[PDB]
Subunit: 358 residues, 4 copies
């Protein structure tokens, strides 16, 4: 009949992302999936800092925020457990004690610097009341390229799903997945390894089975969106929630159960090629965070991906307390921080022991 001459890039099967940064994104992924190491999330918003600086009588100020990061980033020895640090936009431009910017300081000390690139949560305006979307795509490439030049080699974007009445709307399921996928593509085009975070929040009275179903449903659509946008699989990371019961369920779960549900859900949704899964703690206690990761790393279920951590609260709670926002507490805070970082390092190895936590 008729035959036409078209651009190979106009054919569906040739939608894979093409970027001269590919080789580098994979080298970064390799650095981020180093046995016994995980990511330190230090990207808290100025508003979230307030919720940290308040219980220690620390005025939430620009200088005190730098000290809060410094407490951890300049805790010589944490590099052994932390392969990457997700930085807040403010911190990327702050200097360490030696005059080096934090990205320079971390790089020079063998730690990959990362950056939170989303612009915050907003009402979905579709679906159910309470559901939220995430802004940030407009002017993303310009923002990311600037972070790249400053030293960052990976980034993080977070979308949230809120389980209400044992389910979540399709509007939320579809839209937030498309947001995450587009975000990952623009990230790779900018030379930044994207950490895709589709967090099914722990808030609510639902049980672990409900979390499992919603987690699976939410995650599979995220993967489809990713396939749809031609993401380079070997160049990205997933930062999901573990599958556990809700904070108001009054019910708790055993390390092995969480491991079974979490590993099984990832396996049923994620492509074997996905390089790593750096869990978020969000809601779980410091100890549970390590107990669960440890169990996950002992799971008999299939899991080709590196299973580690991307914690904020779980690595900081005890540290901030001992620290107390005071220079005379840096020693204690860093001791507490290194201990938590070490416990999780061993959890990634599956060699964690509750005994080491008293």
């Amino acid at each position: 009949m008729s035959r036409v001459t078209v651009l190979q890039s106009q054919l569906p099967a040739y939608n894979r992302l093409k970027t001269p940064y590919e080789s580098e994104l994979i080298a970064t992924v390799k650095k981020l999936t180093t046995p016994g190491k995980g990511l330190l999330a230090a990207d808290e918003s100025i508003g979230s800092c307030t919720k940290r600086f308040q219980p220690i009588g620390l005025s939430n100020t620009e200088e005190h925020r730098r000290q809060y990061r410094a407490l951890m980033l300049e805790a010589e020895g944490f590099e052994q457990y932390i392969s990457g640090v997700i930085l807040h936009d403010e911190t990327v431009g702050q200097k360490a004690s030696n005059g080096q910017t934090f990205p320079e300081y971390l790089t020079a000390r063998g730690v990959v610097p990362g950056i939170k690139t989303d612009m915050g949560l907003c009402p979905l305006l579709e679906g159910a009341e309470g559901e939220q979307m995430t802004e940030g795509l407009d002017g993303y490439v310009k923002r990311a390229s600037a972070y790249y030049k400053k030293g960052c080699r990976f980034c993080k974007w977070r979308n949230v799903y809120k389980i209400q009445n044992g389910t979540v709307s399709e509007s939320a399921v579809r839209f937030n997945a498309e947001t995450l996928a587009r975000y990952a593509i623009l990230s790779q085009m900018s030379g930044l390894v994207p950490i895709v975070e589709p967090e099914v929040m722990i808030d609510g009275k639902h049980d672990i089975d409900t979390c499992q179903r919603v987690s699976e449903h939410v995650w599979r659509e995220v993967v489809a969106a990713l396939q749809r946008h031609g993401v380079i699989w070997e160049g990205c990371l997933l930062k999901p929630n573990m599958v556990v019961p809700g904070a108001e369920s009054g019910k708790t779960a055993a390390p092995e159960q969480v491991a079974h549900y979490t590993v099984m859900t990832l396996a049923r949704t994620m492509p074997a090629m996905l390089p790593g899964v750096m869990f978020l703690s969000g809601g779980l206690s410091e100890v549970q965070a390590s107990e669960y990761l440890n169990a996950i790393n002992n799971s008999p279920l299939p899991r080709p991906y590196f299973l580690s951590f991307s914690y904020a609260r779980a690595l900081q709670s005890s540290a901030l307390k001992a620290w107390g926002g005071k220079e005379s507490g840096l020693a204690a805070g860093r001791r507490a921080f290194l201990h938590r970082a070490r416990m999780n390092s061993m959890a990634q190895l599956g060699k964690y022991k509750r005994s080491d936590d008293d």
Copy 2:
């Protein structure tokens, strides 16, 4: 087996957008789809104004751009042909010669004020080279609420599709449709009637048949995304390209043909509920735009929606020359303008007579 109580809004079938502005949106649509009337698109970018000031040798200054609009906005008796005006961000805050802002001015003249809310084209970064997406969704509701407060009651957002080698990438077909749909929802939530502009550009060597295929393909996906986002069909409008031969195809279609193809492609993709289709001139001459629109309004094919215009170039090029960017040219400028306005008003009614119009008209394709 097991039962559970969920919010009705969590069920797929109950995804229609909920806004307190519904009534007002529908009323606006009704005003914007008045027989014999069309929309004037005067939302060009500062950068786009420079290209228009070239023929007349005018300096692209803020004040000159104000006069450029006032030239048309303050043209006595234009409301007989114009039901709404798409304003540029800047013009929204500028005053008319009587002191009130253009939105206040237009509103008093019974003309609905509109605003171009998209933030421009950017490389798609997926699909084929040359394809572009449109930014502007971030912080959208905020900007839209402010416009609503100033008087605007409708808006316009444009996505473009470039026919290359007789096709467009799926990455572009899906993504831009999705952007348009999300935009329609945020606009309606903000109280602004959204004019969705999915433009298959006239750029290329492609023929009317290829433009027909791509248009049907590009538009049906726009419709799919709108249904997924639960757009209020009764409260939105479409601003599509007419289906015609590529600017470099070397061919030119007859009104009857353009009418057939355009109306055929709309009917095959658009829900019969869609209130109206306000065509873009997109490069056609002033006369072509009126000829084609007239034929469209005389088509024996299915077309339940109000079919009119939303022209920029096809309504200004002549009035612009006559004007000459001088004060002395206003009378001449406004006569030309009001003439094309009258012509398109006639074409909308399908009672356009090529006699009462110019015997010649040069291409406007940039």
Copy 3:
């Protein structure tokens, strides 16, 4: 730039069906949308026939079902209100008293012979209990071609949707839409104008608003699938349910309300090119069918498509009661039939007068 020559048919934008039957299909559609006329649905299964021969004491036999169709068809002057007849596989091969096969008998009188091509409902085996799918796609072209050679020029296929708890499963919504879509394509490739019947059943306690929501949700997905499979819009017809309250809701809707909801739903989902909509009576009484249709043809809402009927019950009820299965009842049975046919004919024209049914 890396180009490649491919078949135009391998490109997404070029998926519109290609069949030599086009013009004929459009001619048939033209016939089926003759103002003042509608379709007589006479394709009741053997099982459904038993349900009607019961209240008149007629043994459900081949010869008796033939007579059942003969009552309607051999009614002189019916071609005045009926443009097409949906036949049952059995009838296609049966003969009217003059020796002509029913298809030959219809054609001769200017009435298009139609055929029910689906193979019945079966459990969906996905989604919720009570949901059903429709079999019949395997070996479809062979079957359709055989019917074509027998005089049939159009066909019908029915998929159902059961509202339960004010909703229906996405499994049901997606699968049945895909089924109808494939059906339409195969039919047109065989020379038969497909009458797509996506029926949201009246059964249930739901109210008119629930029917409106589900109908719109169900219908738009049928549309979406028809586009994916590249149906020839100019050559197909829709046989939907009217939007009305559930049969067991204990509520009633005024003809004007039914017209408003029904016309509003079709408009929000059906593309403007759709040729016609021939409503099913299913559940509605003989008069309601007429009243509602009439109200619909007086709706001030957008409706570019021919809005008529495709009734079985609403056209045969009273006729059957008068026929009683007796040869001595043909006169009255037939009078009863033409009456109803005429009423709906006027309804199609929006000139129905209730007094004519008093």
Copy 4:
């Protein structure tokens, strides 16, 4: 703010197939994924027996066909390699010398009996010329349950995709994916472990990269369709083609390139929960099928799934020539079969020695 009580099963997140055979389907998967064991494919259509007996000159009859199967199904000591057999319809009814039907036989010999349940390729009638669909979904459960009663515990259905001009149409990518996904659900509900066969045919002059792209594209949709239909991943298998250059490509890929390209394309589209991948020969020589598998099983790339085989030709070819059809050739016949089966069992374990096979293996392509 309105709330409604619905069946949990009407919510999108709860579409996972619910069946009482789950535990069993999984047990069957355990057996079909036994270390060092692959799958024998003796389900060639009757018409395919004539298209394989010609060279060896053997009359095609129910009895001789029974012997064709008897050859290997009765070959002593094949149960250390072949963990399952995909039988043809007819072969399910036939009996083994001992009197027991093949299914009954195999079960006794530990070998799991399976059945080809699809009903052949047909014109897709959508998309590009040459593309094909696969029939058999109508009345499927009825057929499956009959097979279950006779002892069958798994089944196979195969859809094909033709690379033409280096591509395939979405019409095909979408339709065959939905067919396969539906087939999987109906199989599991019928107690049969489904082996999904999304085969990208080796026909054509396309190079390896083009097969990599298409295969990744085709398999993407299969997985997507499977997620929509709610398949029990722990209870199914995939029988895909290897990513090799076209038959008329005028090339040949080394066992290293074939492994890389193949294991990479699987990891990029298959859920990490997929139990196993039983490859097909498609047209590769009896040795390549063993080399490639072996290499595939020596890939450093991620692959949590059991990577084995489900061969026919590359497992019968020789065992066929050295049989002719007489009971005399039951020596050389069963001599060859048990060899090829021994090689693949090695390859499965990644410890296959090419020095063990012949240096003259022609293509089994047709």
